[PDB]
Write a protein that binds this ligand. Structure first.
Ligand SMILES: Nc1ncnc2c1ncn2[C@@H]1O[C@H](COP(=O)(O)OP(=O)(O)OP(O)(O)=S)[C@@H](O)[C@H]1O
Ligand SMILES: Nc1ncnc2c1ncn2[C@@H]1O[C@H](COP(=O)(O)OP(=O)(O)OP(O)(O)=S)[C@@H](O)[C@H]1O
Ligand SMILES: Nc1ncnc2c1ncn2[C@@H]1O[C@H](COP(=O)(O)OP(=O)(O)OP(O)(O)=S)[C@@H](O)[C@H]1O
Ligand SMILES: Nc1ncnc2c1ncn2[C@@H]1O[C@H](COP(=O)(O)OP(=O)(O)OP(O)(O)=S)[C@@H](O)[C@H]1O
Lengths: 118, 610, 26, 200, 198, 115, 118
């Protein structure tokens, strides 16, 4: 909803810069959360200009940008462009075993009683 | 009036002395003039590789029209260069840019033959409108004159693709110069760089900078390559012409740094290195004064220091410090490789040669394969050679050809042809030597490679340079190629050579240096390995204050019961950790062997306890 | 009294790949 | 005056101590001062694998200028860091971008060389067209606008070395990573800054 | 605890990248003290070849290990039906609390000279390029898993050439140009050669 | 018909967002049906990618239909989507079912041909 | 004569024989035609040494002393080109770095049955 209609030349870039100045303007409140962040790379297909516009802003730590991408859609896109790769820290989320999955299942047994009265 | 507004005027700046002389190149001047004086189709275009001088030819033409050495119908012309930047500025309305172009072409139409239009980098005109098309009835009537100059590949990408215009252009190839004429060009440019700085230039610099830039710096072309070394050696000298010189600066900054750190810690240690560095800085300082008591121009050495600092390649006049290195180099290299004295004396004999300027100018400076049985040091040697050329052992460019077992795996070192999947990426050999070529290249186990990689290494040797699947020719003319093997493995001295002739082609052995053959080990030459292993072990666990006490009977006992002349020195490095490492590894986490201890070892008839 | 408003564009052309087809050599 | 609206000012931020102290690397600073003060084609480019410190060298140069350890004809020349993201903000029409860029270049050239421009990550300077980024080509080789940059080693050969008319007008200044022995000194230098932000 | 120290640095480099590199702070030295006898609840006998597998773990948690070598790379063989696969799944049980988090490749299929590419990748320009290798892109995620190699007899002697720089250096390459480090995994090789030699 | 006129940036994206916004604008009575959905992976130029948060949140019902040969070549290689679909498998039937089906369609061809 | 043209005729698939012209035979490394090769190589080495104003005087007895390990008419004259830089090169390189062969000096050759010292 930001590359929505931007067929004119400077239409996307001032839009993104307005969003970023609103984030930078407030007093350290807003923690952003981009899901599926491998779409940052190929943003503006003009000659690489967009996507690496926020590169001088992540180094100063101005937007806290929690993301969540899969394992194998990462070394195809983000490791290709390793100047961005050192801005991001990594948290490795592996699967659990059955011994805790039983406990995870036992707590969700309320919303399914609501949507299906059984 | 509009040409006064948008465009420029070379002849205005020509009459003010605001160019530089274009001494040289009479032929292309006369060619462009003679094409320009034709009855019809007088549109010349300069095409050539960049940096050879194409703007300078038109500037020399402007100088000659100001002087008046031209032929007949070229008096008082005032060559006007257009400005396509200012043509597109604030023209945010509909029918405005074509009317600005029409006003300029109307201002061209009225004067008969005075104005010579000069559009530089004319491949922008194909676009730049959305326009830029109102040239065809203009050039169909001979009004416009249109001298221009593009580069070599940028012409055929746009203009020959769009060939409706190119029939109205006569072309001129611009030729690059050689080493001989570049000296005569640099003689005619010395008189300006003396004025811009406070320096003088000896003609020895104008010889050496033209010669020295031909071999080492291989990316550019000759006329502007040579100006760079002079023009930046002048700036380096102007830095040193100021109040206090270099070095002394290095040492002052260094000792200030160590001072900072030390006082912040208040480590000893550094305390010593401080004092020593203060002795040195003192001595030099005094020397400085002495000299003063007893340079103001560039000499030969300043060009050498510029070409040495940039591109990483060391080439000076043997500045008095490495003479301490290159004579002691055998004993200093024999602190990690024990034995093999006949091999060290032949590896050393290719660095002192090529350092001292006697070596061949189109050859890799070292290319020699050494081989024999295992556990000898043929892999440890290269990681000992690259321990003082670079002063760190992780700066080696190492590939392993035990993985290239088949035909198609050439392309992970030469890159794919263009238009394929991996073309952003490039090779792993080609694009790691073009970035600062001086490193040491390895080839672990050249035997098990497929016998078609060798027809790439035939022009790696014997020529100096190779092509890739991208379009460059990187050169290996000052690296040290090293090949390893284990061939034969049981021959005395000649069955090995028979196996080498059987597996390699004779036209590959012909191009090498001396194929060394290693000898193995000896019982006396094993104790010197043992105490190096033990001191390395102490240096490893020097972090918990846990030094050792090995008695000489135990160090003698380590030499004996792991010995055999069939596996080399590899079983000793396992026997050390089987004797010490079991008991130490068990007792160290079992308490009681805490920090600040000198634990001994003592001889037992089977083990050696703690 | 209108304007021009020079619009942008997007380009695409994919790549190929080759296969090696080993030979059993007897 | 137009550079007030499309730029930051590193010298103005350096004059209140708002930059992390740069410790080490005398050779690269001396090399940048050597290249930036020649007569023509005076514009270096910092090149190295990422993370080794390339912005830190330019911030150290700003510290050394505001301190004053430079030679005579480099004193009091503010480093105005340009942009290319903020300049293509409102650029819908067919001539506004080139007008804006020509205003910037005219404002730089109107001075007496008192300004050192600084385009960080200049591998984006080829695009922004639709021509553009090509009207800066005659200004570079004459020697008016001083330009300092910083690329990664592997975006360089993809975006700039494709366009060999440009890359002749630069000076590649390689920057290699240090060993452990200098990193211990760097860590002893920057120890005080994190003890203040985190009170430990 | 009012200042940082050399322990919390090790805590960070443990919790990121998953490698246990601490000091065995008084809790899990109780485990590694009993490892020759804890492992005996699933493997019976074979006592002289548990006192060596139980030693490349203790010497690598004390800090005596060679910092550029895999922590243990040893090959055990013998007759069939003895427990030589059950052992290599039992020492992957208390290190990981599971038994399926190990890199189990089987070299019983590499009879010919061109199945190298399924564990080393493919050179650029060819069909499956962005796929990596099967050996390579299962280590680079979590560089601590134990690796099997089942029935290494049937491999053609070209796969051993790939395996030769795995040992004693720790790194290999692939198409993308990265050198994946095997410096702290426990390689394990099985075989059945002879099967009854005196 | 949705990639009809697009040689721009962001042209397909708005045309897709209007359709998704007209779906979730309504209440739950617009069960969708994309037939031959193996053309949802490509069509980028990044596209076919506004649909991924909408799938695993229960918004559009999306009865799909792929042939098995085209499935494992275009979707299973791109495994972020394969947990956003349940794989109802349809095997081919036996003879008597086909005899029943052919007795079903006896009516229509008699209209289409007077035999 | 026979086997060479029999192998030559077989590897010309169609129409490479009668559309070129006649085939000639090499005349390899011979004792009379060996001197001028050494002349060209020594002129090359003098080109390499004339920059630092040092030049050579080479006699004919040394020029025929090199002709023992320079004849070998199977592999060719390449070990001659190597041994020129082997025997002369290391002695010259050892002398030149430790001073004492100061600029403007010439170097003469001095024959030995295995070396040739200076
Ligand atoms: N005969 C000459 N006399 C003086 N300077 C020369 C001569 N030949 C070349 N040069 C210099 O070489 C450089 C050539 O610069 P330009 O010709 O303007 O660049 P170019 O060769 O045209 O490449 P491009 O494509 O225009 S960037 C300038 O510094 C000239 O002064
Ligand atoms: N003469 C020696 N002096 C010192 N260390 C040695 C010597 N010979 C071997 N070593 C040690 O042995 C190890 C080097 O093994 P290498 O001899 O390099 O194996 P290699 O020579 O590569 O044989 P292969 O067939 O290639 S495995 C290091 O630990 C060296 O310290
Ligand atoms: N010599 C140095 N002195 C002080 N701090 C340094 C030094 N070198 C690096 N740093 C610090 O280490 C970090 C270096 O990050 P940057 O230099 O900004 O990365 P970079 O050099 O810009 O590389 P990229 O590709 O642009 S991210 C910063 O936090 C600096 O403060
Ligand atoms: N000493 C033992 N203790 C416990 N289980 C054992 C023992 N010896 C064998 N087994 C069991 O024997 C079965 C097969 O042993 P494996 O080790 O899997 O076969 P193997 O030893 O690998 O021989 P090959 O060469 O692979 S057929 C498993 O179910 C083991 O649990």
């Amino acid at each position: 909803s930001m590359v929505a209609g931007s067929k004119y030349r400077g239409e996307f870039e001032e839009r993104l810069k307005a969003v970023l100045d609103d984030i930078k303007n407030s007093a350290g409140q807003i923690i952003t959360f981009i899901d599926e962040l491998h779409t940052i790379v190929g943003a503006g297909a003009t000659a690489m200009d967009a996507g690496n516009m926020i590169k001088p802003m992540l180094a100063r730590g101005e937007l806290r940008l929690v993301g969540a991408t899969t394992l194998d859609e990462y070394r195809k896109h983000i490791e290709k462009d390793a100047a961005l790769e050192r801005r991001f820290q990594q948290v490795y989320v592996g699967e659990p075993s059955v011994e805790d999955t039983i406990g995870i299942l036992r707590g969700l047994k309320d919303r399914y009683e609501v949507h299906h009265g059984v | 009036q509009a040409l006064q507004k948008y465009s420029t005027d070379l002849t205005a700046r020509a009459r003010e002395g605001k160019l530089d002389p274009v001494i040289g190149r009479d032929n292309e001047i006369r060619r462009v003039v003679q094409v320009l004086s034709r009855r019809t189709k007088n549109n010349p275009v300069l095409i050539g590789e960049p940096g050879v001088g194409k703007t300078a030819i038109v500037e020399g033409l402007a100088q000659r029209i100001v002087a008046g050495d031209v032929p007949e119908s070229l008096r008082d012309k005032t060559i006007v260069a257009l400005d396509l930047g200012s043509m597109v500025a604030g023209s945010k309305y509909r029918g405005e840019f074509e009317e600005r172009l029409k006003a300029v072409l109307d201002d061209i139409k009225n004067s008969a033959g005075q104005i010579i239009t000069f559009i530089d980098e004319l491949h922008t005109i194909v676009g730049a409108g959305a326009a830029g098309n109102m040239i065809k009835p203009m050039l169909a009537r001979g009004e416009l004159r249109l001298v221009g100059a593009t580069t070599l590949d940028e012409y055929r990408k746009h203009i020959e693709k769009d060939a409706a215009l190119e029939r109205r252009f006569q072309q001129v190839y611009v030729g690059e110069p050689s080493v001989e004429d570049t000296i005569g060009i640099l003689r005619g440019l010395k008189d300006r760089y003396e004025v811009h700085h406070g320096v003088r230039i000896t003609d020895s610099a104008l010889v050496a900078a033209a010669t020295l830039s031909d071999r080492y710096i291989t990316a550019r072309f000759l006329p502007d390559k040579a100006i760079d070394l002079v023009d930046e050696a002048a700036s380096r000298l102007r830095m040193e012409i100021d109040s206090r010189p270099v070095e002394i600066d290095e040492v002052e900054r260094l000792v200030r740094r160590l001072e900072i750190e030390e006082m912040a810690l208040s480590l000893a240690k550094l305390r010593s290195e401080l004092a020593d560095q203060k002795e040195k800085l003192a001595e030099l300082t005094t020397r400085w004064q002495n000299e003063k008591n007893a340079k103001e121009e560039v000499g030969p050495d300043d060009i050498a220091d510029v070409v040495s600092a940039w591109t990483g390649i060391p080439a000076g006049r043997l500045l008095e410090g490495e003479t301490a290195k290159l004579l002691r180099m055998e004993d200093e290299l024999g602190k990690r490789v024990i034995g093999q004295k006949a091999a060290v004396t032949a590896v050393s004999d290719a660095v002192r040669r090529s350092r001292a300027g006697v070596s061949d100018p189109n050859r890799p400076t070292g290319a020699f394969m050494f081989l024999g049985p295992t556990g000898v040091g043929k892999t440890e040697l290269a990681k000992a050679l690259a321990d003082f050329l670079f002063d760190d052992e992780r700066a080696m460019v190492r590939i392993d050809m035990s993985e290239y077992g088949e035909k198609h795996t050439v392309a992970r070192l030469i890159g794919a042809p263009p238009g394929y999947v991996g073309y952003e990426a490039g090779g792993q050999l080609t694009e790691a030597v073009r970035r600062r070529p001086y490193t040491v290249v390895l080839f672990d186990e050249i035997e098990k490679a497929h016998p078609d990689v060798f027809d790439v290494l035939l022009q790696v040797l014997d020529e100096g340079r190779l092509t890739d699947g991208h379009g460059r020719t990187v050169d290996f003319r000052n690296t040290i190629l090293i090949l390893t093997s284990n061939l034969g493995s049981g021959g005395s001295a000649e069955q090995v050579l028979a196996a080498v002739r059987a597996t390699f082609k004779p036209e590959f052995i012909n191009r090498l240096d001396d194929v060394l053959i290693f000898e193995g080990l000896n019982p006396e030459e094993l104790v010197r390995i043992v105490d190096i292993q033990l001191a390395q072990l102490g240096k490893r666990l020097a972090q918990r204050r846990l030094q050792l006490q090995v008695s000489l009977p135990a160090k003698r006992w380590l030499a004996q019961r792991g010995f055999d002349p069939v596996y080399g020195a590899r079983p000793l490095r396992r026997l050390v950790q089987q004797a010490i490492g079991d008991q130490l590894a068990k007792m160290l986490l079992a308490g009681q062997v805490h920090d600040g201890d000198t634990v001994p070892v003592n001889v037992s008839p089977d083990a050696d306890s703690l | 009294a209108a304007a021009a408003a020079a619009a942008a564009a997007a380009a695409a052309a994919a790549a190929a790949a080759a296969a090696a087809a080993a030979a059993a050599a007897a | 005056q137009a550079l007030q609206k499309y730029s930051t000012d590193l010298t103005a931020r350096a004059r209140e101590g708002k930059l992390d102290p740069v410790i080490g690397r005398d050779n690269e600073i001396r090399r940048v001062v050597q290249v930036l003060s020649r007569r023509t084609k005076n514009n270096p480019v910092l090149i190295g694998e990422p993370g080794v410190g390339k912005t830190a060298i330019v911030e150290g140069l700003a510290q050394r200028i505001v301190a004053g350890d430079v030679p005579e004809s480099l004193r009091d020349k503010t480093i105005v860091a340009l942009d290319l993201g903020s300049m293509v903000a409102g650029s819908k029409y067919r001539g506004e971008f080139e007008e804006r860029l020509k205003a910037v270049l005219d404002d730089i050239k109107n001075s007496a060389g008192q300004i050192i421009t600084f385009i960080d990550e200049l591998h984006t300077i080829v695009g922004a067209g639709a021509d553009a980024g090509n009207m800066i080509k005659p200004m570079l080789a004459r020697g008016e606008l001083r330009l300092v940059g910083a690329t990664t080693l592997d975006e360089y050969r993809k975006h700039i070395e494709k366009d060999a008319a440009l890359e002749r007008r630069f000076q590649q200044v390689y920057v290699g990573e240090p060993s452990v022995e200098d990193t211990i000194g760097i860590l002893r230098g920057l120890k005080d800054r994190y003890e203040v932000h985190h009170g430990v």
